[PDB]
Structure 1
Amino acid sequence: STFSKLREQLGPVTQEFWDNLEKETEGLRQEMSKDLEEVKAKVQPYLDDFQKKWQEEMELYRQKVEPLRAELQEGARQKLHELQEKLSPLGEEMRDRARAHVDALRTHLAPYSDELRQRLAARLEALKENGGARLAEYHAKATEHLSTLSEKAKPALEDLRQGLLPVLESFKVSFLSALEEYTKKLN
């Protein structure tokens, strides 16, 4: 820890010198920034004046384009106003002719779908009846085939635990003693 105290003392001495040296450059930069600040203020009205010119020039165009822009708004409006009405009758007509078809389709397929679904429902029943007969038997064999191994798993695993512990206990104690010695060297 002695080395820490050394650097902690050597640093301050040189640090003060560094601060002083940097402080000189600080003022040097301030002078240069001051000159730059001056230049910014000097050319300020110059750019401002030119801006005011373009501002008015652009605005003058906005005034001239106003009426023309409004006319083109009308000329375009009077176009679709004629087109909309022209394509309205056939548009609504075709819509209805489609809607009625959908209704007819649904109603026409209804009777066919009923008989078909009922026929299938009855057919599926015949399958479930036969399947469920053998399904119960296979399920019974399942549990018998699974409980067999698990019964001989617990006692076996426990027997192994009691066999590893004896030597393990010795290792744990040996580790504890070594662990303490490790910390002593580190700290």
Structure 2
Amino acid sequence: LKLLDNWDSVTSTFSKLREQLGPVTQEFWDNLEKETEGLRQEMSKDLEEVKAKVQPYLDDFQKKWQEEMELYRQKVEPLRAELQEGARQKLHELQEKLSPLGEEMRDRARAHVDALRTHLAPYSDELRQRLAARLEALKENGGARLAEYHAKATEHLSTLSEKAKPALEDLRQGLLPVLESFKVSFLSALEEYTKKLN
């Protein structure tokens, strides 16, 4: 009933707002027409003058831009020549170093790797020896560890049986009556929700 009662007031509000909306749109549009027309009148000023004045404006800018480009073109040629001739020398000096220093670095790299290779030869074998020594130790100790781990796991499993059988039974024997007690309170609660909220 309350919904319909309050809705009736909302309906009247909508009606009054709609009745008022009429004049409102008329008044708003009336002023809007002054704004639109004002902008239309000013269009023969804003747009018109910007169209007429854009001629000498863009002409000046375009002309200066052309001059700028002309100057840039007249500069880019000698400057590119300088850049070319300069780069030729700059790269030449680099090449004059890339050959000797490059070959030298290559030969030095050979020695760098050679020294490492000569050192890595015994080291790699020793590393394998070390790994073998570790693997063997970890194999014997690991076997003992696993055997003991299995034993511990078996003992934990045996004690786990005390949880799977007695403890679980105790839990079951405890939960059974509790569930019944909880069901009663649950059922009675369900009634409450159908008594107060209905």
| Aligned-partner Cα distance in 1 for 2:62–2:171 | 92
| Aligned-partner Cα distance in 1 for 2:153–2:111 | 58
The alignment yields a C-alpha RMSD, in angstroms, of: 5.5
Superposed, 1:56-135 pairs within 5 Å as 56-86=67-97, 88-115=99-126, 117-118=128-129, 120-122=131-133, 124-135=135-146
Q: Equivalent residue of 1:153, what SS?
A: helix
| Distance apart, 1:111 and its partner CA | 3.1
Structure-1 residue corresponding to 2:24: 13
CA shift in 2, pair 1:5/1:149, >3 Å = farther
CA shift in 2, pair 1:22/1:96, >3 Å = same
CA shift in 2, pair 1:97/1:27, >3 Å = closer
| Distance apart, 1:47 and its partner CA | 2.9
Q: Equivalent residue of 1:186, what SS?
A: coil
| Aligned-partner Cα distance in 1 for 2:33–2:181 | 65
CA shift in 2, pair 1:152/1:76, >3 Å = closer
| Distance apart, 1:117 and its partner CA | 2.8
| Distance apart, 1:135 and its partner CA | 2.8
| Distance apart, 1:121 and its partner CA | 1.1
**Cα-to-partner distance string for 1:111-150 (whole Å, 9 max, x where unaligned):** 3542453255145414422441353133233243246347
Deviating more after overlay: 68-77 vs 152-161: 152-161
Structure-2 residue corresponding to 1:4: 15
Alignment: residue pair count: 187
| Distance apart, 1:92 and its partner CA | 0.6
CA shift in 2, pair 1:151/1:38, >3 Å = farther
Deviating more after overlay: 34-43 vs 135-144: 34-43
**Cα-to-partner distance string for 1:90-110 (whole Å, 9 max, x where unaligned):** 431242133144135314431
**Cα-to-partner distance string for 1:51-109 (whole Å, 9 max, x where unaligned):** 22432353144225513531442144134424522552243124213314413531443
CA shift in 2, pair 1:39/1:13, >3 Å = closer
